[PDB]
Amino acid sequence: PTYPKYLLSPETIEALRKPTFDVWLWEPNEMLSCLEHMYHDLGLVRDFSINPVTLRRWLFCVHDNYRNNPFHNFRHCFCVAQMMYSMVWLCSLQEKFSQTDILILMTAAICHDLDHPGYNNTYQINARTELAVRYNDISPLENHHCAVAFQILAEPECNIFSNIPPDGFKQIRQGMITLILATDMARHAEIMDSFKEKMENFDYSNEEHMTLLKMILIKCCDISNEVRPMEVAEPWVDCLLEEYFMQSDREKSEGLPVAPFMDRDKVTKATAQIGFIKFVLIPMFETVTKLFPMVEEIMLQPLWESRDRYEELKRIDDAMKELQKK
Amino acid sequence: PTYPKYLLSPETIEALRKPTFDVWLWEPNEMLSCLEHMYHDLGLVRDFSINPVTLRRWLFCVHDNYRNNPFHNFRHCFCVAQMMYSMVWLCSLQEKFSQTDILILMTAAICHDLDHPGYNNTYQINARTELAVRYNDISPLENHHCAVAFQILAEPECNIFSNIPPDGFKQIRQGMITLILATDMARHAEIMDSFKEKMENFDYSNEEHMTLLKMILIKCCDISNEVRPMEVAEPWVDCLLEEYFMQSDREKSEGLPVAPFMDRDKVTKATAQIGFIKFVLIPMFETVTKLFPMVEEIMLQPLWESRDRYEELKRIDDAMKELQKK
Numbered sequence: 001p002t003y004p005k006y007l008l009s010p011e012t013i014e015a016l017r018k019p020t021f022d023v024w025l026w027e028p029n030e031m032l033s034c035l036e037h038m039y040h041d042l043g044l045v046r047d048f049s050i051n052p053v054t055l056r057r058w059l060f061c062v063h064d065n066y067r068n069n070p071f072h073n074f075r076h077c078f079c080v081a082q083m084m085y086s087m088v089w090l091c092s093l094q095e096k097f098s099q100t101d102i103l104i105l106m107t108a109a110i111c112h113d114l115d116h117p118g119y120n121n122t123y124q125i126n127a128r129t130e131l132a133v134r135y136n137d138i139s140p141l142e143n144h145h146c147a148v149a150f151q152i153l154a155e156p157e158c159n160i161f162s163n164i165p166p167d168g169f170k171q172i173r174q175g176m177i178t179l180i181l182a183t184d185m186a187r188h189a190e191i192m193d194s195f196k197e198k199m200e201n202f203d204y205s206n207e208e209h210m211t212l213l214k215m216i217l218i219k220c221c222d223i224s225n226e227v228r229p230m231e232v233a234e235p236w237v238d239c240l241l242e243e244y245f246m247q248s249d250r251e252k253s254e255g256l257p258v259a260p261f262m263d264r265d266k267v268t269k270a271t272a273q274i275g276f277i278k279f280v281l282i283p284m285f286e287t288v289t290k291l292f293p294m295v296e297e298i299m300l301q302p303l304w305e306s307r308d309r310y311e312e313l314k315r316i317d318d319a320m321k322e323l324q325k326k
Numbered sequence: 327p328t329y330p331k332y333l334l335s336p337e338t339i340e341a342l343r344k345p346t347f348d349v350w351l352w353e354p355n356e357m358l359s360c361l362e363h364m365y366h367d368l369g370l371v372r373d374f375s376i377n378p379v380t381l382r383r384w385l386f387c388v389h390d391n392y393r394n395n396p397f398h399n400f401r402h403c404f405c406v407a408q409m410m411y412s413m414v415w416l417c418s419l420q421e422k423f424s425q426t427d428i429l430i431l432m433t434a435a436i437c438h439d440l441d442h443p444g445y446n447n448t449y450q451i452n453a454r455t456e457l458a459v460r461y462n463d464i465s466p467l468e469n470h471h472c473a474v475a476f477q478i479l480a481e482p483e484c485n486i487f488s489n490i491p492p493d494g495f496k497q498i499r500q501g502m503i504t505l506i507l508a509t510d511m512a513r514h515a516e517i518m519d520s521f522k523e524k525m526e527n528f529d530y531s532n533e534e535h536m537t538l539l540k541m542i543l544i545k546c547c548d549i550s551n552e553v554r555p556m557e558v559a560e561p562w563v564d565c566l567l568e569e570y571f572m573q574s575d576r577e578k579s580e581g582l583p584v585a586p587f588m589d590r591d592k593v594t595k596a597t598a599q600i601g602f603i604k605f606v607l608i609p610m611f612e613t614v615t616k617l618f619p620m621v622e623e624i625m626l627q628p629l630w631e632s633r634d635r636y637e638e639l640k641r642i643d644d645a646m647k648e649l650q651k652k
């Protein structure tokens with residue numbers, strides 16, 4: 001017949017394995033279904049005896065704890081989780097990783113931005129917010145995301161880990177905290193340097209080596225929008241700027257310092273992305289290719305195309321702003 | 327928070343394992359949810375690699391193929407399956423049957439009345455209907471139910487058996503055909519004897535003994551309404567008689583012979599159940615108790631009560647009639 005949206009079509013489930021997945025077509029429930037599918041399709045529900053109904057109540061509770069920010073919302077959480085899923089296949093991670101590592105990667109991806117307020121760490125700190133005070137100015141948001149993540153898992157009806165031995169729970173919790181805190185871009189340069197150092201002789205058996213690979217992987221998925229088709233990727237830039245402007249506006253109406261790349265008067269869609277793709281996204285993915293070559297053709301390619309389009313879009317912006325000058 | 331209806335609550339997941347579960351409390355979505363749970367709970371999803379999304383579409387296609395009959399509708403098949411599920415627990419059937427036989431048992435129960443027209447075989451045959459002509463008067467309805475069942479499983483996106491090797495599929499299909507065809511009451515006495523015969527020295531090793539046991543199991547669940555609590559059971563009697571009268575009226579209208587037990591001028595809710603419980607239901611469960619003693623308390627007990635209740639209800643009924651000519 002013609003089943004309800006909650007049910008994915010076999011086509012959708014096939015496309016769910018690729019980074020070309022159009023994340024914009026779905027309602028929260030269809031997304032919840034794709035997330036649910038990923039846990040089954042990866043052996044996680046199986047290998048960790050996750051109660052199938054609990055998996056769903058957990059996903060609803062998670063979704064319920066994301067806010068309606070223009071960027072940091074549940075759909076962002078979904079893109080990140082969905083991209084991570086694509087990489088588990090693209091790079092055949094289940095070969096290099098244990099199921100516990102996969103559990104940690106996916107679960108951290110889904111919870112990495114829980115309860116985000118829409119104003120980054122810098123605002124929190126400069127505004128001396130309740131979060132900044134609670135976390136002594138140390139990765140306040142990310143710390144907060146973890147806390148909320150484990151508060152949700154503390155509710156028995158949502159505890160997708162209730163059938164995991166405490167020894168393994170401790171390992172999963174430690175892994176998730178490390179990954180969620182690694183998403184703080186303040187630590188980008190440091191983490192990248194650490195990874196590249198280990199890269200001088202990677203070892204899939206070295207535990208510190210694998211922890212950095214996972215940190216790099218979740219970081220990759222978190223900021224991978226431009227890896228997607230321009231039609232799917234662009235609307236995200238607008239949401240990010242919408243959130244950025246909202247913060248800077250507030251920072252101005254409070255005399256608090258403002259960042260150039262978040263300032264209405266100094267940034268454009270293209271200037272936001274050119275620097276980012278060239279000095280952040282590409283280098284990070286570039287070093288990952290050395291570990292997984294297929295990454296180049298599937299993710300480094302669209303990034304070059306992306307970087308090129310904005311570099312052109314920038315010339316037109318300038319040309320139009322020169323006819324607005326006096 | 328408050329999760330949608332298709333997410334079963336713990337209290338429901340536990341009541342679902344008993345013949346005492348109240349089937350009239352749910353809507354198709356909730357019932358579709360309970361069925362899905364059953365497959366997960368019995369580990370059928372596990373041991374057969376049933377893609378969980380595929381299972382959802384399938385149950386949905388099955389629900390679409392049931393008709394708005396007063397008795398033979400989706401809710402009826404839900405009862406049959408739920409009762410089957412109950413017995414797997416009560417009787418610890420997984421201790422006697424393989425996961426293949428439990429799959430056959432459960433799947434057959436859900437499909438046993440697919441696309442039922444609302445008029446029994448006697449009607450199909452006397453009216454020389456298309457089904458009667460298609461099946462040469464041999465169990466036209468049961469053969470049809472089975473055929474729709476496999477027409478549904480033939481749709482790639484509904485084939486919950488997609489990951490079973492063809493060797494296994496064959497075995498599942500033969501079992502299902504056997505079980506669904508065994509539900510034709512015209513075959514009752516015949517099947518009861520084969521079973522009673524082999525019961526003299528039942529042997530779970532013997533494949534023929536197991537086939538008869540499974541045939542008895544699906545037959546028990548298919549007509550088990552009276553095993554359920556008087557409140558849950560009674561409404562079904564009305565649904566059945568409604569369906570029966572619909573047929574008898576049409577038969578009288580088209581000059582076709584009418585069955586006494588479907589005659590509006592002879593049948594009464596009471597007389598219908600006394601004969602049925604005493605001569606069909608109780609005798610069948612009595613023989614099953616010899617293999618599963620726990621059945622006597624959980625199923626025979628409520629049947630004795632129901633029998634006495636309708637028998638008293640018959641005295642009242644007579645008393646009331648004679649009070650109308652004295």
Ligand SMILES: COc1ccc(NC(=O)[C@H](C)Nc2nc3c(cnn3-c3ccccc3C)c(=O)[nH]2)cc1
Nearest residue numbers: 185186188222223224225226240261272273276280
């Ligand atoms: C101090 O650490 C940082 C912070 C920001 C940036 N780059 C940006 O924020 C640029 C200007 N905008 C940008 N930021 C992006 C994108 C994707 N995620 N993402 C993002 C979102 C929240 C926090 C940080 C970043 C990078 C993106 O496509 N563009 C680079 C490094």
Ligand SMILES: COc1ccc(NC(=O)[C@H](C)Nc2nc3c(cnn3-c3ccccc3C)c(=O)[nH]2)cc1
Nearest residue numbers: 511512514548549550551552566587598599602606
């Ligand atoms: C020839 O096979 C039959 C057919 C009917 C009966 N007796 C009945 O149908 C009695 C009068 N009504 C009855 N019939 C019932 C019940 C449950 N299923 N069920 C039923 C439904 C469809 C076809 C046959 C039966 C027995 C029930 O609780 N009562 C007994 C034997």
Ligand SMILES: COc1ccc(NC(=O)[C@H](C)Nc2nc3c(cnn3-c3ccccc3C)c(=O)[nH]2)cc1
Nearest residue numbers: 586587588592593594596597598599600601602640
């Ligand atoms: C399978 O169809 C049957 C046949 C018999 C019964 N049980 C009875 O015969 C009931 C308990 N006693 C009874 N039943 C009667 C009478 C007349 N018709 N009738 C009856 C009741 C239900 C169904 C068919 C008939 C003929 C009657 O005088 N007494 C119940 C269902």
Ligand SMILES: [Mg+2]
Nearest residue numbers: 112113141183
């Ligand atoms: Mg974040």
Ligand SMILES: [Mg+2]
Nearest residue numbers: 438439467509
């Ligand atoms: Mg039937």
Ligand SMILES: [Zn+2]
Nearest residue numbers: 076112113222
């Ligand atoms: Zn994020």
Ligand SMILES: [Zn+2]
Nearest residue numbers: 402438439548
């Ligand atoms: Zn039936």
